[PDB]
Amino acid sequence: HHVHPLPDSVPESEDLFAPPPRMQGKEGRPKPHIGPNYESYVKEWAKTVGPNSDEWWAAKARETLDWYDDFKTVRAGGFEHGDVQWFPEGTLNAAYNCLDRHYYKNPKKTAIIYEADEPSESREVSYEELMQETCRVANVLKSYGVKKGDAVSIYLPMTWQAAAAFLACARIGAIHSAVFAGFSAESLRDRVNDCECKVLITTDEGRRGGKTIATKQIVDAALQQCPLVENVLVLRRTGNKVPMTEGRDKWWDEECAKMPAYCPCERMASEDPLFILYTSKPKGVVHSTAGYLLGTALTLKYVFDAHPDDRFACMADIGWITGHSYIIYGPLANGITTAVFESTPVYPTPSRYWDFVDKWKATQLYTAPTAIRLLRRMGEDHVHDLSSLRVLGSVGEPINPEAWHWYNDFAGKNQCAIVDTYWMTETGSISIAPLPGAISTKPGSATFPFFGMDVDIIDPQTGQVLEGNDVEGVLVARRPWPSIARTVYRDHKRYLETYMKPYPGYFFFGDGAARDYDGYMWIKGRVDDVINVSGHRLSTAEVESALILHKGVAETAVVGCADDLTGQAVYAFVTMKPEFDLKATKEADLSKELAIQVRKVIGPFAAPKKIYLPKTRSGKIMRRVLRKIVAGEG
Amino acid sequence: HHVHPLPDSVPESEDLFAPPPRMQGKEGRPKPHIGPNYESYVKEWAKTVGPNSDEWWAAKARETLDWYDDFKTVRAGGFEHGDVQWFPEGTLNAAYNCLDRHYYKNPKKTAIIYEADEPSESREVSYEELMQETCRVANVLKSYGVKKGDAVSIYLPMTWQAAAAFLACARIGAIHSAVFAGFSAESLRDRVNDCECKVLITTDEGRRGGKTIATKQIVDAALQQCPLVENVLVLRRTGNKVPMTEGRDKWWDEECAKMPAYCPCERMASEDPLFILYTSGSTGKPKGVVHSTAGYLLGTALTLKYVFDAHPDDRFACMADIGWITGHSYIIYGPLANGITTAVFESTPVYPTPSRYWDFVDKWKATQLYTAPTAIRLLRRMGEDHVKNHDLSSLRVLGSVGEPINPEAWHWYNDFAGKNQCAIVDTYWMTETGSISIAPLPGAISTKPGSATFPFFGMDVDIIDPQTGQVLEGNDVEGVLVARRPWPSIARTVYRDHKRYLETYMKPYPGYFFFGDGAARDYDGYMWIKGRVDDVINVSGHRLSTAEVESALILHKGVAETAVVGCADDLTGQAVYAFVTMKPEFDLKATKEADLSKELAIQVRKVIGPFAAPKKIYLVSDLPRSGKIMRRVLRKIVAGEGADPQIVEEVKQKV
Amino acid sequence: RPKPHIGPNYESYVKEWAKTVGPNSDEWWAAKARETLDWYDDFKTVRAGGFEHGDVQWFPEGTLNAAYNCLDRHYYKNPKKTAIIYEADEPSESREVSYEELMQETCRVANVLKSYGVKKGDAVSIYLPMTWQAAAAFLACARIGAIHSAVFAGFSAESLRDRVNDCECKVLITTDEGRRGGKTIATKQIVDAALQQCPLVENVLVLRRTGNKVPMTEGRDKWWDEECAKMPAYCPCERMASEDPLFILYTPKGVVHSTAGYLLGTALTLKYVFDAHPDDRFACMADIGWITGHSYIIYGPLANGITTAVFESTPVYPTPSRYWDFVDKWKATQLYTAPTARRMGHDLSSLRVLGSVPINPEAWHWYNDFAGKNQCAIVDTYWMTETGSISIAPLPGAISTKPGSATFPFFGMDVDIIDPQTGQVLEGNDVEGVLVARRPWPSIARTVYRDHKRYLETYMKPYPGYFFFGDGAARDYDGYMWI
Ligand SMILES: CCNS(=O)(=O)NC[C@H]1O[C@@H](n2cnc3c(N)ncnc32)[C@H](O)[C@@H]1O
Ligand SMILES: CCNS(=O)(=O)NC[C@H]1O[C@@H](n2cnc3c(N)ncnc32)[C@H](O)[C@@H]1O
Ligand SMILES: [Cl-]
């Protein structure tokens, strides 16, 4: 075969895992929504793409969400000019769909499982409580003069009120712009100025893993160069003394105590913007209302097989798109229970995830590879019952197949489906992932595209589509889907040039990908991280997966630097486990073993020329820093 | 029985009055909506409360009002957090329901009977004229930058244009805040700043009882300490010279002449706030009671239709002032929503003479009259010569609101205003309830002097023992009044002071709404509201209402009005002190002042008991704007402290 | 040739015109209102109000948007159809603009205006020549509920200063220069002169029609193409009430038109007076600065979903044949031109209906033979800014017409003539007097901006309960009108 899976130590013939009995109608668990096999997924999927799929999408939009005004047109527009429209004549409100309509049905049902940094301080927040808090904040924002279409910055740690602040903006038609609680003032400042907001929502302090985040202190520093901000609403998270500027700053609880506990919903057009989410000038990705909300609702229901009594535990941060979609909007739209985890996976112990799972009988767990490195690395003594789990998800970057099996074995007792979810901030919702009740998985593969996603592979050297299977190139989408980002805030040109110009006719994700002989999709990393050695273009995922097969390796990152005899050369930056003895295995001897590992697993063309990690707050490895340093640019 | 009715001079067996023939469909009058007996009231009422009342309320909401968008949910929320919701997904506009839809049906039907202070200046205002005036003001407010949800203060006397100012704000989604024309600048200023409005609507002057109110003069004084006000719209009521600040102030007639006579309606969510009505209440600051749109509007429409048995051609004569909740609900919103004729009375009941009410009724053939006990007592003091020589046959329902009505005043009302041929409706409610809470349905309920009787549709009230916090099951019980579940017209908050809203009405008896009134349900199930809990007097363990001691006093020949307050007493805890006003004709020389007092105390001792007999009686000329007697002032005077500051000194002298 | 909608004799035009007036006048206007336009919300009341107090209302409860009805709905049905034929001043610079392209430009501009804080109900002034982006400007203002005030591109800086200050607009849309009859119309120069005394105007959007160097006030002035490059190509439509104002057109008498009425009147007149059909190519040579360009270049044609022409030249540039080179080059199917234009000195078989807007009666024969070849129709049209849509015209495939007259007044308008000395209408035929109208029509102007007083003292108070046109008119034994 031309297309190889990510290097793994397990035979390929033993790496095809069918839906287990928990994802079958047995053991008293809900029968899957889609199942039991690959053909059942394809049968439904073919209704969601092609020239006769408007029928399916209209029904799903009318069944999934509540509308104030029906829509007439299902879809229009396209990539070339970026005029994407879905359900354009309809009106709705995101807070009505995430709060009110469930409050009216079961007001005492739990909406948020607030897992505080300290396990003792945790509690359940009901749809009644969350709605009242949202409506109070919404009334406060209106009293500040916030109007439909105004931007509101949010700088909140993972306390449950963060959901109320997001939904308060959506309730009144404001455009919330979340900034990870922990970015520098320079990062907070740039995002506040770009969106031109006049109101900022934040806390006095945060708490994560026992540490103290000086959110208010950072804000005051950033706001010295954010001229337009006139109002700041400070949640009293800790109560510890923080500076409160007179007039500009007010306490959340004092402001809310003056306001009523209900607020009307602003009737929003489908294409009114719901939020701006900046990405690390800053790129403010803009999502509209109806299509984004429907995408998050549909993906949560099918990719995680969500059922009414489920308790969904996404361990990400609301400052990132994974929090937007699968902590707040997705789960609350489906009306289930969602987790807001304010701690780290290592506090009080590396068993918090598992203590959390057993304490709350969580039905799905959704975290990232960068955190997955933690648990499997430190010890499986930390891994409990975990029987409540039924679907396990991973998001953020390629998952080395080695981490994949531990996830299947110890967290799932070989009884959970593992869903590797591929998507971007700009897709809004999950693009390629297995439906747990239908798809037999492979370690390290995203598998098949989700409803509405018609993806293909393009040879970047010819610009043409590679027909068939067992092909490799760059991933592109053929048609718009409802949750696609609609622009980059006040910079539509950057939007078109980045995603719509590189391969005209298609959307360009920016990732290398391959479709193997079985049709399974494999995402191998950024195209900008590809290294071309003597005509062999190498992905960062395959070299880094082969390295992690050597004893003692924890995490790696390979970058390319120019080479006069091979064009570029692979340079690998390697991190070792703490117990590993660097004296027994000399650094020169370690590199020799690693280069032989890569040569054996990939080929001589891939052997690193030199072996020696800078990571953003989102958990991503800053490979652009490793590349420039190797060249000698400070 | 343990529960006694308010003192009356008629035997209890002879003091139950069944709907007269005018409310039996006879004499050419329209058949009542509910009737003909108590059972017909209960049959409908039981559809309006309980866990299966959503069906009735959904239907009445869709039958009574015109909606731009239908609603899905009927009710949600509750007392505990103050998140009451009614018809939340629906949209409508109050001005469309009060003007446009009736204009489109019968544009020339009369909307307002404008009874000016001078009777010669009175005229009829049709729905077309009022709609056009409303739309001109709305355009004027919008030209000023007024947006949906902004507060607009109104300081207007009782001229018909006051309705156009209220409905102009409602038409564009502004929040109107009315201030009684006659409050001091100090009271106006507090209300203008609290609601944070930028636009004020007022007159150059007012006219009441022959006097001239210098509204603009008061306004200018108030606005020197109102930094947020940017625009003032001055109706040209008198034409006498007033100071007009350049730019800030503009003439109503000049501004409106520039605008079109139509304006689109703002589509409002049911729960968007419709108005703020401040009350000089509780203490310290003014309490801005906030009502939302759909539930308030539906509450006033339904109460007017059933409590006053309103039919399409009726001519409803509420003699209250639009600066108070009775004016909001039963001059403007209630009647105009029902599409009938409503009266705007610019005079007093004694100007030019005490026959004004009755001249008005016959002049316009009014079909229902709605006034207060303070005016019934006032007229009753001036003589039956001014009321005896009138027809008054057009009337068929007479209403009383504001406080408990003494059975003596009740009988004067029934005898001379209704000629024993009208139904008397005693309406109990508050600013905070939005609409009538407890009252008799005139075609169905047999009344008792001084009793409101039974709760209105949607009101499920109870009596609570304030010392046990428990509901007193059964009849012949006494305590404080409470409501069990929200109703559609309940106030939704206190403007920017939700804590004051929860603390005042929702915390004192958790699970309930606390009216603040003592109440009792007699053996027949009739409810009796006898006065504020803060006004109770306790003599040797006997908790006394001010209404029952004052009802017993007024049974003595010559008594016009009384006021009793409690004073501390070392041997009985408190003691009753009574302040008495007599009729003009009564001779103080024939019956010495001391001998009169003894007869009064013996009256109370006989009817209530010696513990209620006043220890001392002060004969005054008058008692100390809403028509309420300032008993808190008389209480402080008898203790030793220190609308008209002259009576206050007059009291201090006799005391 | 497609069959005309109304025909073939008068009894077909009496059975129809009898429905647009009278007691059941409502039932007909209600059907047409629902059939012609797309509504976001239905309407309950057909008509209310009258001339007396100036409270005219049509379809008050309904909501809608002019851009959705002139762009989106046709885009969704056939996006590549040509909405505009842009006949540049230089004939070889002409090109077709599709509904898609026209929609995307409108949405961009609409997004720009929103970034400047323009809100529903705000005023925006438009100082543009007859380039095709003028319709995108009009419709971008309508798309967001903003009130556009079109000021003809030839007006002086003084006349623009006055029109911009009356409407109180905070945003102005102009070009850097114009082009007409081979000449250059310095519009930004005139814009900078006037604005020195326009204290409310805070943002100006300048379209590069020539690229020539012009002054740009930093901060206030921004380039159209640079501002629009930052915005998405879709914008939501504001849900407007029928009686929300759509535009101000000063004659400083700023005539105001509501939305659903003016739009219904414009759509119906094109579909009948000119007998427009789906594939027709309506050519109107007016300017978007006047009510002729508003109603029969932009709103009427783009509402019916046909093709309309934006003619940027004169009738004699390059040569007096331009109309007829125009007509054959694009196969125009209707022609609409002024009185001004057989004195300075082609196939044309595609023309089917020909109209003007008084013309000497010999021009009626010349316009029927040299332009029609005794195979075309001829429709004469009189009206004014305050009427919203053409008032007096004959229906083409039904009514046998005569030179100089107009057979019958348009659907839903019933006029008469008053004796200016007795103030009594002269019933009957063979009469003369001052022209006035009876009852309300949908497209009637609703006020004069912030001078409803003048609105009454000019058209309502002069003759009680009537609309006073201000021009003398006469009727003859044939039931025909003369201005
Ligand atoms: C939506 C989360 N955004 S993200 O967490 O910022 N991820 C950063 C970037 O990593 C890539 N990516 C995401 N998920 C996967 C995956 N499962 N396998 C391989 N690659 C992946 C995408 O290009 C994304 O833009
Ligand atoms: C809507 C009235 N507004 S009011 O004029 O402000 N009345 C002041 C307060 O008096 C009490 N009250 C009112 N009506 C009655 C009545 N009929 N019998 C006994 N008590 C009554 C209420 O607590 C009210 O709030
Ligand atoms: Cl699996």
Short mmCIF file of N, CA and C in Angstrom, two decimals, chain A residues 69-70 72-73 76-77 81-85 88-91 147-148 150 269 271-272 486-488 490-493, chain C residues 38 40-41 68 72-73 75-76 80 100 103-104 108 114-115 119 228-239:
data_model
loop_
_atom_site.label_atom_id
_atom_site.label_comp_id
_atom_site.label_asym_id
_atom_site.label_seq_id
_atom_site.Cartn_x
_atom_site.Cartn_y
_atom_site.Cartn_z
N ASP A 69 -39.01 32.45 14.02
CA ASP A 69 -39.51 32.53 12.65
C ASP A 69 -38.86 31.42 11.85
N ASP A 70 -39.68 30.72 11.07
CA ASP A 70 -39.20 29.64 10.23
C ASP A 70 -38.30 30.20 9.14
N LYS A 72 -37.02 29.79 5.02
CA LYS A 72 -37.50 29.47 3.69
C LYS A 72 -36.41 28.81 2.86
N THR A 73 -35.27 29.48 2.72
CA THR A 73 -34.11 28.94 2.04
C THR A 73 -33.28 28.09 3.00
N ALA A 76 -27.36 28.88 0.73
CA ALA A 76 -26.95 29.67 -0.42
C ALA A 76 -25.53 30.15 -0.17
N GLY A 77 -24.94 30.78 -1.20
CA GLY A 77 -23.58 31.28 -1.11
C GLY A 77 -22.52 30.20 -1.31
N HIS A 81 -16.58 33.98 -2.69
CA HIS A 81 -16.66 35.31 -2.10
C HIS A 81 -16.94 35.29 -0.62
N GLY A 82 -17.24 34.13 -0.05
CA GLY A 82 -17.51 34.05 1.37
C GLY A 82 -18.81 34.74 1.73
N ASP A 83 -19.89 34.22 1.17
CA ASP A 83 -21.25 34.69 1.37
C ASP A 83 -22.12 33.53 1.80
N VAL A 84 -21.55 32.66 2.64
CA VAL A 84 -22.23 31.45 3.07
C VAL A 84 -23.46 31.81 3.87
N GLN A 85 -24.58 31.18 3.54
CA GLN A 85 -25.85 31.38 4.21
C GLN A 85 -26.47 30.03 4.50
N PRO A 88 -31.44 31.37 6.02
CA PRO A 88 -31.28 32.82 6.24
C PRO A 88 -32.53 33.57 6.72
N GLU A 89 -33.74 33.16 6.36
CA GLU A 89 -34.89 33.93 6.78
C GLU A 89 -35.34 33.61 8.20
N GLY A 90 -34.80 32.55 8.82
CA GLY A 90 -35.25 32.16 10.14
C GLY A 90 -34.67 33.02 11.24
N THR A 91 -35.38 33.04 12.37
CA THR A 91 -34.90 33.73 13.55
C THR A 91 -34.97 32.79 14.74
N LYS A 147 -25.97 46.81 22.94
CA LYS A 147 -27.02 46.62 21.96
C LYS A 147 -26.69 45.45 21.05
N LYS A 148 -27.73 44.93 20.40
CA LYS A 148 -27.59 43.87 19.42
C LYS A 148 -26.45 44.16 18.47
N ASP A 150 -23.23 44.44 19.33
CA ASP A 150 -22.06 44.94 20.02
C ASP A 150 -21.17 43.79 20.48
N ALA A 269 -31.54 36.80 13.58
CA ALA A 269 -31.50 36.16 12.26
C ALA A 269 -30.46 35.04 12.25
N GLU A 271 -28.09 34.34 10.35
CA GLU A 271 -26.75 34.81 10.02
C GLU A 271 -26.26 35.96 10.88
N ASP A 272 -26.99 36.37 11.89
CA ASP A 272 -26.40 37.32 12.85
C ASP A 272 -25.19 36.66 13.54
N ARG A 486 -17.90 32.28 9.07
CA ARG A 486 -18.45 33.12 8.02
C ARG A 486 -17.50 34.22 7.57
N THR A 487 -16.52 34.55 8.39
CA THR A 487 -15.54 35.57 8.04
C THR A 487 -14.44 35.56 9.09
N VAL A 488 -13.45 36.41 8.87
CA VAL A 488 -12.52 36.86 9.89
C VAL A 488 -12.87 38.31 10.18
N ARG A 490 -13.67 41.86 10.47
CA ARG A 490 -13.15 43.05 9.79
C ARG A 490 -11.93 42.74 8.91
N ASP A 491 -11.76 41.49 8.48
CA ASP A 491 -10.62 41.14 7.64
C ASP A 491 -11.01 39.99 6.71
N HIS A 492 -12.11 40.18 5.97
CA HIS A 492 -12.60 39.15 5.07
C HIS A 492 -11.56 38.72 4.04
N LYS A 493 -10.64 39.62 3.66
CA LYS A 493 -9.60 39.25 2.71
C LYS A 493 -8.71 38.15 3.29
N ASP C 38 -42.55 39.44 -1.18
CA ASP C 38 -42.28 38.48 -0.12
C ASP C 38 -42.32 39.19 1.23
N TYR C 40 -41.86 38.95 5.50
CA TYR C 40 -41.43 38.21 6.68
C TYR C 40 -42.60 37.96 7.63
N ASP C 41 -43.53 38.92 7.73
CA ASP C 41 -44.75 38.81 8.52
C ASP C 41 -45.96 39.29 7.71
N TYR C 68 -34.37 42.30 0.15
CA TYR C 68 -34.74 40.89 -0.01
C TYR C 68 -35.59 40.73 -1.26
N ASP C 72 -32.27 39.26 -2.91
CA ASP C 72 -32.10 37.91 -2.36
C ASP C 72 -33.00 36.89 -3.06
N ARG C 73 -34.30 37.20 -3.13
CA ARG C 73 -35.25 36.19 -3.59
C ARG C 73 -34.96 35.80 -5.03
N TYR C 75 -31.87 36.16 -6.45
CA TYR C 75 -30.60 35.46 -6.33
C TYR C 75 -30.82 33.98 -6.03
N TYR C 76 -31.71 33.68 -5.08
CA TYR C 76 -31.93 32.30 -4.67
C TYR C 76 -32.56 31.47 -5.77
N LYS C 80 -27.27 33.87 -11.65
CA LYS C 80 -26.44 34.39 -12.74
C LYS C 80 -27.21 35.32 -13.68
N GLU C 100 -26.32 37.91 -8.37
CA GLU C 100 -25.31 37.50 -7.40
C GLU C 100 -24.32 38.62 -7.14
N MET C 103 -26.02 41.45 -5.48
CA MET C 103 -26.31 41.15 -4.09
C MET C 103 -25.06 41.25 -3.23
N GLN C 104 -23.94 40.73 -3.71
CA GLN C 104 -22.76 40.71 -2.87
C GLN C 104 -22.25 42.12 -2.59
N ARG C 108 -21.93 43.85 1.11
CA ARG C 108 -20.68 44.44 1.59
C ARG C 108 -20.91 45.85 2.11
N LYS C 114 -22.96 49.37 8.75
CA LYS C 114 -23.14 48.92 10.13
C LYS C 114 -21.87 49.12 10.95
N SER C 115 -20.70 48.97 10.34
CA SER C 115 -19.48 49.23 11.09
C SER C 115 -19.35 50.71 11.45
N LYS C 119 -27.84 52.81 12.13
CA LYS C 119 -28.90 52.02 12.73
C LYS C 119 -30.17 52.11 11.90
N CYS C 228 -15.01 47.61 1.67
CA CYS C 228 -15.80 46.42 1.38
C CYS C 228 -14.93 45.16 1.37
N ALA C 229 -13.64 45.30 1.07
CA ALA C 229 -12.75 44.14 1.12
C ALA C 229 -12.63 43.56 2.53
N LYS C 230 -12.98 44.32 3.55
CA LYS C 230 -12.88 43.81 4.91
C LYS C 230 -14.14 43.10 5.38
N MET C 231 -15.24 43.16 4.63
CA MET C 231 -16.56 42.73 5.09
C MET C 231 -17.00 41.46 4.39
N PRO C 232 -17.90 40.68 5.00
CA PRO C 232 -18.45 39.53 4.30
C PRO C 232 -19.39 39.97 3.19
N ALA C 233 -19.70 39.02 2.31
CA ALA C 233 -20.55 39.28 1.16
C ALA C 233 -21.99 38.87 1.40
N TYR C 234 -22.35 38.54 2.64
CA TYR C 234 -23.76 38.43 3.01
C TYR C 234 -24.01 39.27 4.26
N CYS C 235 -25.18 39.90 4.31
CA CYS C 235 -25.61 40.69 5.49
C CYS C 235 -27.08 40.36 5.73
N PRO C 236 -27.56 40.24 6.98
CA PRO C 236 -28.98 39.99 7.22
C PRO C 236 -29.83 41.19 6.88
N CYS C 237 -31.07 40.92 6.50
CA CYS C 237 -32.02 41.98 6.20
C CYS C 237 -32.75 42.36 7.47
N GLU C 238 -32.81 43.66 7.75
CA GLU C 238 -33.65 44.14 8.83
C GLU C 238 -35.10 43.89 8.47
N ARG C 239 -35.88 43.41 9.44
CA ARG C 239 -37.31 43.19 9.24
C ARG C 239 -38.05 44.50 9.46
#
